[PDB]
Amino acid sequence: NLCPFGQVFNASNFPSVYAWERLRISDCVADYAVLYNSSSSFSTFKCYGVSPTKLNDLCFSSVYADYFVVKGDDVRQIAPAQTGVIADYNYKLPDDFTGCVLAWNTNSVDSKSGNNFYYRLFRHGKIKPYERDISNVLYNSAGGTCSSISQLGCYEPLKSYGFTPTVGVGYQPYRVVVLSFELL
Amino acid sequence: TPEDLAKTFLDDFNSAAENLSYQSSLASWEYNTNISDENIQKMDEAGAKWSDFYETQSKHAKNFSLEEIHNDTVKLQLQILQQSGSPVLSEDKSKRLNSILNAMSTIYSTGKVCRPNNPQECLLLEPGLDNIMGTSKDYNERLWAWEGWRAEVGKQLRPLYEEYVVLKNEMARGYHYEDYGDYWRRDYETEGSPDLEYSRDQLTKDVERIFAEIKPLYEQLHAYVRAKLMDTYPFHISPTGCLPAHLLGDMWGRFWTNLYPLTVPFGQKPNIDVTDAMLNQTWDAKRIFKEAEKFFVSIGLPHMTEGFWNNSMLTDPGDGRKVVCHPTAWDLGKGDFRIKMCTKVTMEDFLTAHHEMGHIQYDMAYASQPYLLRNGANEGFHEAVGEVMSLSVATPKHLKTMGLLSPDFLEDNETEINFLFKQALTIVGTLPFTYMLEKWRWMVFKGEIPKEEWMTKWWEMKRKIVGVVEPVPHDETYCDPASLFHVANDYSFIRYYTRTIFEFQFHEALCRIAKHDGPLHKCDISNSTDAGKKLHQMLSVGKSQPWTSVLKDFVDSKDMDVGPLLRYFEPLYTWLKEQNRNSFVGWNTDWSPH
Ligand SMILES: [Zn+2]
Numbered sequence: 094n095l096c097p098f099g100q101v102f103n104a105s106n107f108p109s110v111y112a113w114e115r116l117r118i119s120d121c122v123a124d125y126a127v128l129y130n131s132s133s134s135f136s137t138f139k140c141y142g143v144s145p146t147k148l149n150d151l152c153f154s155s156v157y158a159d160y161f162v163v164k165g166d167d168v169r170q171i172a173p174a175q176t177g178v179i180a181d182y183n184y185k186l187p188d189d190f191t192g193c194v195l196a197w198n199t200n201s202v203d204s205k206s207g208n209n210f211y212y213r214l215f216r217h218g219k220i221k222p223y224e225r226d227i228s229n230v231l232y233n234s235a236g237g238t239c240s241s242i243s244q245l246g247c248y249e250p251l252k253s254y255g256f257t258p259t260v261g262v263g264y265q266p267y268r269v270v271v272l273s274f275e276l277l
Numbered sequence: 278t279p280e281d282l283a284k285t286f287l288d289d290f291n292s293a294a295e296n297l298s299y300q301s302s303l304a305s306w307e308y309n310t311n312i313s314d315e316n317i318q319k320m321d322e323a324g325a326k327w328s329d330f331y332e333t334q335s336k337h338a339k340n341f342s343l344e345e346i347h348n349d350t351v352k353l354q355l356q357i358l359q360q361s362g363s364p365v366l367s368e369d370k371s372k373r374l375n376s377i378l379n380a381m382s383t384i385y386s387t388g389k390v391c392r393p394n395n396p397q398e399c400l401l402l403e404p405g406l407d408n409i410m411g412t413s414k415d416y417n418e419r420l421w422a423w424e425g426w427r428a429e430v431g432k433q434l435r436p437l438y439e440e441y442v443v444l445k446n447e448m449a450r451g452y453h454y455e456d457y458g459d460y461w462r463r464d465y466e467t468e469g470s471p472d473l474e475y476s477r478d479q480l481t482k483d484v485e486r487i488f489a490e491i492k493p494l495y496e497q498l499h500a501y502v503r504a505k506l507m508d509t510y511p512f513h514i515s516p517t518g519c520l521p522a523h524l525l526g527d528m529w530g531r532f533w534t535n536l537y538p539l540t541v542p543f544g545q546k547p548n549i550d551v552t553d554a555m556l557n558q559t560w561d562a563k564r565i566f567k568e569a570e571k572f573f574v575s576i577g578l579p580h581m582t583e584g585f586w587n588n589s590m591l592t593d594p595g596d597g598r599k600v601v602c603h604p605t606a607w608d609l610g611k612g613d614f615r616i617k618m619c620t621k622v623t624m625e626d627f628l629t630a631h632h633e634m635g636h637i638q639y640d641m642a643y644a645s646q647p648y649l650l651r652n653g654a655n656e657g658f659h660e661a662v663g664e665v666m667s668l669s670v671a672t673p674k675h676l677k678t679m680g681l682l683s684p685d686f687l688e689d690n691e692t693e694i695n696f697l698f699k700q701a702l703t704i705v706g707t708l709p710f711t712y713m714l715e716k717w718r719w720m721v722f723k724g725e726i727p728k729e730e731w732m733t734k735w736w737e738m739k740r741k742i743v744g745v746v747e748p749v750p751h752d753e754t755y756c757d758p759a760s761l762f763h764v765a766n767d768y769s770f771i772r773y774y775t776r777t778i779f780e781f782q783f784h785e786a787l788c789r790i791a792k793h794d795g796p797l798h799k800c801d802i803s804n805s806t807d808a809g810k811k812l813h814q815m816l817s818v819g820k821s822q823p824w825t826s827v828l829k830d831f832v833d834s835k836d837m838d839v840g841p842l843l844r845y846f847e848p849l850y851t852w853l854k855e856q857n858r859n860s861f862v863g864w865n866t867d868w869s870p871h
Contacts (some may be wrong), residue, residue, distance in 0.1 A: 214288065215288075235281070235282050245340060246282060246285075248285065248288075248289035252292040252293060255296035255299050255300075255611055257299075259303070259609075260611040260612055260613050261582045261584050261611065261612025263612045264612045
């Protein structure tokens with residue numbers, strides 16, 4: 094059969110930044126020629142390690158796909174050796190990350206009045222490469238742990254994006270999916 | 278680490294205040310685009326949820342010590358947060374105060390001056406009472422529209438303003454300020470280096486010092502205005518006394534721009550008017566704002582956002598939408614910038630299509646700043662970015678390259694005065710009125726003016742400072758100062774004085790980086806990317822640095838200068854002297870028209 098990129102690129106619902114969904118893809122054939130000239134929709138097609146047009150000839154095994162929704166100016170933090178909020182608390186890529194981080198604007202679909210996307214914004218530590226933090230809805234204290242919101246130094250982590258369709262560019266939902274082309 | 282406890286507290290604030298104020302500003306946008314009973318209740322409930330978040334986080338910020346914080350970036354954010362919240366007023370008086378502010382705006386907006394002969398027809402100020410006060414020249418007709426606005430909206434606002442100066446004074450003393458006037462002089466307050474330090478009482482010392490240097494230019498301007506208006510009013514103007522306060526420009530006498538058909542230096546020269554030129558060409562309300570985007574993008578400032586044109590209300594909508602359409606440049610947050618203005622194609626709206634587009638590209642500039650540091654350097658810095666674009670666009674050399682002016686419009690020595698006198702009516706003609714309206718209120722809130730002497734010392738400062746005399750006697754039953762929009766709706770009016778001093782201080786600084794060789798009024802910073810990189814350096818700091826440091830790095834002067842304003846009108850100030858040789862330069866306080 095072909096490669097199941099329809100469930101990755103054209104999925105019905107994408108998750109938030111912290112609870113991103115991992116799909117392990119192996120033993121597939123994909124048409125990267127039509128994905129190479131798809132720049133009319135994809136706002137970001139940055140690649141690392143390999144050329145965008147040369148990966149079709151190379152055979153990769155156990156290709157991972159981490160797909161999520163960030164805001165418009167948070168697509169810069171899906172790069173290797175990048176520092177920021179979601180590059181250290183939500184989703185961190187290693188320095189030897191090979192593949193193409195793929196992002197496109199989704200202000201029309203992923204910014205309705207019922208959707209809700211969150212980010213971590215508060216954690217005691219640095220997120221490891223390819224580490225998925227679980228949905229830990231627990232209040233973060235400045236020192237140790239706390240119980241309720243009224244305690245000083247105690248802030249809830251999961252701050253939601255205010256995704257309305259009327260926000261300006263940079264604060265609009267961008268569906269980011271990486272393609273970690275692991276080799277051998 | 279005391280820094281990291283306050284660093285993450287602001288990150289708790291900035292990740293929660295950004296969404297709570299964006300829904301507050303979207304509900305504020307929905308009230309200001311169509312007024313309904315279902316829109317006010319969505320506005321204030323979001324406006325009080327943000328106000329509950331305003332005062333809850335302010336109390337948590339006071340647990341941090343500013344002395345143990347050794348980072349100036351988070352110290353200034355804590356200084357705004359510790360000093361804005363928890364008013365000392367009770368629950369009953371806060372409902373009383375919000376009832377007053379919602380009544381003074383309702384009396385001013387829904388108020389209307391009906392004719393005493395026939396009270397059926399009645400002008401609700403829009404449209405009405407500004408074509409009369411802006412174009413008509415009759416003495417007995419403008420007296421009705423001026424005194425009538427001080428009667429219908431004056432007697433109905435005096436008891437609301439007598440309680441306004443008490444509750445807001447008590448509210449200001451809850452933040453340990455002395456009076457409500459000292460609560461308004463906090464945008465100019467500066468703490469930091471001893472040389473770059475600006476106290477709240479140094480503003481009153483500097484503004485009085487600046488007006489002592491404006492007054493040689495203004496009194497020659499006032500003498501030439503009175504001499505030219507003496508031909509239009511041959512019986513109701515004394516040749517050595519004060520001008521009538523109702524015959525000058527607007528209704529209140531703020532701008533003198535409507536006197537340019539009457540006070541014209543050379544009537545035999547063609548006008549610099551763009552109103553008839555835009556109507557004769559293909560020029561809609563989009564190109565009012567689309568061509569203004571071309572001026573900002575010519576100097577290196579970025580384009581408007583893709584959601585700017587879709588979301589802004591650039592024109593008055595149909596389908597029976599009741600909208601208050603005062604021109605305001607909304608920064609709703611989260612990268613969303615809008616303009617709420619119902620344009621009417623004239624020369625006045627073409628310049629406010631750069632003034633409202635001057636807050637934009639300033640709001641777009643400090644978007645990389647933290648959320649609390651997302652204002653101007655002061656309130657006069659924010660209003661001067663748009664108006665310094667009203668100096669480089671309104672030049673006849675720039676209108677010739679725009680195509681809106683004829684190619685045969687030669688710049689003679691007489692058209693250097695027609696343009697400059699029009700810039701003297703708008704800009705120099707508003708400096709004494711803006712100064713004393715924020716000198717009357719600064720003494721009313723202090724207690725220097727008792728409540729039984731409000732209107733006595735209001736006109737005693739109109740004659741001495743501005744040079745205007747009331748056409749009818751006013752007792753204490755009237756409230757003429759509260760007839761303005763910025764006074765009845767609780768707005769600071771010292772923006773328009775301090776932005777004018779910064780309007781030409783920015784302009785002379787921009788024209789020396791643009792390598793302009795010539796007079797200051799002939800300058801044009803268009804198509805110059807070097808005069809926009811230094812402007813955007815000034816715009817991108819926001820309120821991160823004190824305004825005495827932002828001004829020093831931009832115009833190479835620390836304090837407010839008026840020398841750039843005088844050098845702009847130095848070709849006119851020489852010409853104003855030779856025309857006022859026969860006439861008298863000054864005004865007499867004791868003269869009364871009645
Ligand atoms: Zn403005």
